[PDB]
Ligand binder design. Structure first.
Ligand SMILES: Cn1cnc2c(O)nc(N)nc21
Ligand SMILES: [Zn+2]
Ligand SMILES: [Zn+2]
Lengths: 189, 182
């Protein structure tokens, strides 16, 4: 607690980070990220997941999910975990460091203003999102104040941006979380 | 780094100690003076020239302290603010610093936050942010604040986080300059 910043990973996320995995097509990468969303929701976390891949080979470097409530840490969004775990594994703060393959972050949702800045500092060269900011806000979450034309912001820093990839499935998982997110017991959740 | 079951960012000894030693600093300038000591300690421990600490806003009881651990920590998210807010939340056992019955918390920072930390401050539940060095001062030694929204301060204030800036600005700048020179 008090000698380190320590956010524990639920087993399914340990498993995801331990098992070698190559997913070539963007839809394959996002399909896998959306499996983590569903698993995270069943392990007490928020409806968001993200993974860092080698952009050109499809090799999964590290995955993260939203652990804000179970990990008691408002910074524990999926993207922060995924980026930080990828950095720890490749032993550098800078995923663009000399000698590293170009890295891509694939995220179940467009980033909040915090994760937006994290993406910029991280060194990934591309960002691929499923759910749009409006989908996320629809179930009550807040993206916070991003700068005007944040996507342009990214591209002007050499970070390519794609969004809407498997958005339908991503929206369906947001709604499942929402519909199970009350206090009144509903066997079915 | 080592462990595959956690995101684990180790803190250097002065910062472990800052996090486990009792300190009550009533005046704003006393809080900021303490954060500036951390800045200089962190530089000597191979970190960036930034520190922050979360205090109880009224009493000035220090809850937790963070510094920039990006390079030695291998973690671009390890800015001073992210560590200080996260360690405070850990110690108070909640992801939300304005959870009912917790005292109002305040983030005292050696410089204005970058766009990432600006987001982190919004989600954290702190009700006050107090900065030393300005954005300009920070760019003037080659750190990037990133594309923050126009009127980031009004953004915080509209969400119930009061903002004070420039507090011991000159002292904090002298440490920025020293960092940049060495
Ligand atoms: C809005 N929001 C809250 N938590 C989030 C997370 O972990 N990822 C993304 N993309 N958005 C989030
Ligand atoms: Zn986020
Ligand atoms: Zn920052």
């Amino acid at each position: 607690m008090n000698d380190a910043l320590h956010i524990g990973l639920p087993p399914f996320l340990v498993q995801a980070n331990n098992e070698p995995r190559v997913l070539a097509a963007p839809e394959a990468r996002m399909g896998y990220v959306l499996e983590l969303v569903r698993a995270n929701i069943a392990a007490d976390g928020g409806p968001f997941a993200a993974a860092v891949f080698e952009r050109d080979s499809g090799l999964l470097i590290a995955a993260g999910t939203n652990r804000v409530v179970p990990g008691r840490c408002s910074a524990a969004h999926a993207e922060i975990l995924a980026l930080s775990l990828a950095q720890a594994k490749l032993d550098t703060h800078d995923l663009s460091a000399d000698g590293l393959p170009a890295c891509e972050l694939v995220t179940s949702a467009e980033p909040c203003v915090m994760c937006f800045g994290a993406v910029i500092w991280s060194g990934v060269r591309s960002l691929v999102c499923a759910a749009r900011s409006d989908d996320v806000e629809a179930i009550g979450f807040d993206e916070g104040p991003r700068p005007e034309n944040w996507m342009g912001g990214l591209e002007a820093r050499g970070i390519t941006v794609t969004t809407g990839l498997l958005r339908d499935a991503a929206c369906a998982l947001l709604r499942e979380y929402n519909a199970c997110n009350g206090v009144i017991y509903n066997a079915r959740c």
